[model samples]
Target chain A: SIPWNLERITPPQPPDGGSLVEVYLLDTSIQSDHREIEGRVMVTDFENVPEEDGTRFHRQASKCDSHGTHLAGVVSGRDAGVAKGASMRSLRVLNCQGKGTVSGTLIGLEFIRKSQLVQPVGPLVVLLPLAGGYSRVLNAACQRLARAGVVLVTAAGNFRDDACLYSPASAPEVITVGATNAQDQPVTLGTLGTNFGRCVDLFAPGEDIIGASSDCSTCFVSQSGTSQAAAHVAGIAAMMLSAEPELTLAELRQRLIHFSAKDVINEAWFPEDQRVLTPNLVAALPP
Target chain B: TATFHRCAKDPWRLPGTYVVVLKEETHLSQSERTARRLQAQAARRGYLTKILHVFHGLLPGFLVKMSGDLLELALKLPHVDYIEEDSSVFAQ
Candidate 1:
């Protein structure tokens, strides 16, 4: 079980050439040249910052980093991708340090919503792996994206606190994911870290997961976080849309739950009240 | 439990920057006007305001930087959906 993360969740077959599923990776700038990324990924920066002298504007405000590239690989990497045939697009909301603001993210959401209007006659999936404290505006934005027929998937956070206290994760319309180990138990890298409770939709593999990297053209790296878990779901969502391009958000949500392997996650360590509400399931593709 | 006033300061509020979301998600013209009107009104009240981004699609809103006084004023303004203190978000 070298790459047990991939083995635990089955990957979908490559999307057909005529498929129109597009996944938007909302994170930092991705290394487009990475081998696992293939040629379909289109990366763009969110903020078009202007110069102090006002002579010119800078489009690439931040340099490419590993976080975004890693997420891209998990979603549609040539080898590790869940939907190997789905189209991929990167939007740089976080800086190279993996830090961004709620306002900046709002801007990114607006961009994606407007972009989807002109193209992608099929399904559109937005993979948001970032999290912060509760903000009604952010949650509202996520809801609007859902209303526009885009599947929103987000991280439940790594704070080990109740997922209900975090923005976007607490948002009801989006699918929020918690991190789990290969054994399908809640992950505890140092101490207990994965956010849980009623806000989480499902648990996914997040421990020492191997994904593509930006360090080199053919480099691969192992990292762990709920972000990785959400990426796994993003790929799954893309594949589901690839098969059923007409699937609505509600239908897509139901299908994910139906396809999941139920009662496979161990939750004895969680608080009694939360354990009762949290679904004991791990994300799995439909067989 | 102790009672707090409506104007009481938020202990957890991040200083200086806040996000102002408008109620309407359409009509870019009206949204832009509302944002500018609020910015001008705040300036007249001796509070400087910086408009970071005027979001029009999906969510109609604006990201701004202003004094605590302007924050309170925006909270009381009409057609404003949400006024939240901007916070740092990171990739999880």
Candidate 2:
């Protein structure tokens, strides 16, 4: 069965052959047992180094934190995801409450960079399903990842304000995603609505998206946010990499926007002038 | 002496924790050495310091904790590019 979020846009079928593409989910924790994410998911266990300690900050994610699991479903879950054949790795940057420290996140980004150096994978994409206000350090790190050839996708945030005010979203090197409802309308509910502005690369289905749940191996749940929206783009990026294993980061980023559904998102939430900077594009697979 | 860049005032900033980024070094081998030296200097200075992580990829930086008032001390360390207060991030 096709999910409405996925149904909103036509994504590519699971590719049969390519060098393995890795999509890292930098969120809470992912429950690998869920059927949608089971076989493709890999977990890591480490604890946040105490604030006063010298150890690296990497936490073993708690099961209660299902945000990452849901994102995994959207990114590449066998049934619930976009790129079913892409490999997924869990980097539990956010804790059980779906909160984390910027230091922890930076460490996670560094870890991803190091892993790629050691293993030299075909192509990689990182899904940052988390958001916070502006931080130049975070922005620089994101840019560094982009220069290092890692395609990054981030949530436009639920702040309902300018996405440019957020950190990773504001980072010019990433593909920031805004959320839209099944009706193809931009989600703008005041406080918890999708953020829009020049920073947003495109829109995707993010409201009331249903995916695999951590409650049980076969269970499913529904969630809504730009986090889910970014996962869709991440999955699409992974699939694109599957088809064109040699696409550079810039080429991939451009292709995502170039092949997207343009002038299709309803932008009545903002005045025409204010909406001009926000691309009226919706994410789509090669089309 | 290094100039201190104002830390980003984030709504979820973690007090006393900062990420210190160093400017680009000419030689790749000269990168993390400076970060490690800075960390040792901070500790030697009797600041309540903790080296969180020494970044070797992309950006040469270190996540460190020091007394908030003394954040200037870390910012003033040699070859520092910029400093930012670490902030809390959430699933959005």
Candidate 3:
């Protein structure tokens, strides 16, 4: 067990008496009435978005991507979300089977970008699963949103090799997160490469995580990928923003990285000093 | 340990070998920065070819780009090595 310095620092709360944290799940739609929970999450339909093959993104609006749902749940799902008390907003970018084109993802990013203008309190966190995108486009989008004070968190891709094979996450100005298991080991399927070494910001729990499944029910999945890890980081971001409503996206990111657990030497998957264990909320919360 | 003939040799320096260290100039204008990056990239690529026989290795023909404060507005060039303040080397 690690010893934490004990100094009481009471963080400022929202004036409305409730902290509001918005999460953008760039995936397919979720089930009916799932948004009615206490968290008051919003689900945006991307069914009309054009697919890569020119087909409708998803035939059923309520047919959600299991990965997307799980990620959303991890952020603001009724019971399981790391920030269960924080509100969530789900934006469907990919199809029901977790398939999406670059355009769809950009649309989702734009949606989050626009939402930041209207969100009352807390920082906006966008969770992206897919990797490998047009860096110029993504960098421009992230720069625009970040200048407006929005935070984008993305998965590192589950390539399992050292081949940093994804974009948006690879883009500058955004936080790229990798995944680790309960044992604090880097997920074998997590994508890694030279680009990741150059760009990845942090790591989080992703393997064998229990979250909302495809059936719109509670389920435990043994998923091992950077997508789930991104969700964990997103959830933590929401929690941090919810606790400290005045902090900027960059400040929140720095706090998360600064408070993250240290890395062990000689770890195969995580580069030395690159991988950090899941964040500790009690220790990370501001005074 | 067997004693052998010791021959004095001068410092080994190849005539055409170049150690090009690219640094970002944050104070330059965007256009000026881009021009500098392109020039550095082209020079690095050309230097690799000139010293190919000396190194006896085939280097990728891509130009490497590093963005410092100087080239903050431009994309990083390919094949160029990026060295950080921590003494770490990165090739992106």
Q: Which candidate is the best by DockQ?
A: 2
In model 2, pairs of residues that clash are none
Candidate 1 interface RMSD to the true structure: 4.2
B1-92, model 1: which lDDT tens digit per residue? 11111111244245677777777545677667767887889878887788877778787667778876766567666667667776667789
Candidate 3, residue A196: lDDT: 36
State interface RMSD in Å for all models: 4.2, 1.7, 18.9
Error of 3 at A132 (Å): 2.0
Docking class of 2: medium
Off by over 4 Å in 2: A11-19, A46-63, A271-273, B1-11, B26-46
Q: State the lDDT at A163 in candidate 1.
A: 91
Docking quality category of candidate 3 according to DockQ thresholds: incorrect
**Where does candidate 3 chain A have its weakest 10-residue lDDT segment?**
A1-10
TM-score of 1: 0.89
* TM-score per candidate, chains pooled: 0.89, 0.89, 0.60
Ranking by DockQ: 2, 1, 3
Candidate 1 per-residue C-alpha lDDT over A101-171 given as tens digits, one digit per residue, 9 for 90 to 100: 77778888888887877664567888989987877778888998898778899999998878988877999
After best superposition, candidate 1 residue A94: deviation in angstroms? 1.0
User: What's the distance in Å from true for residue A127, model 1?
Assistant: 0.4
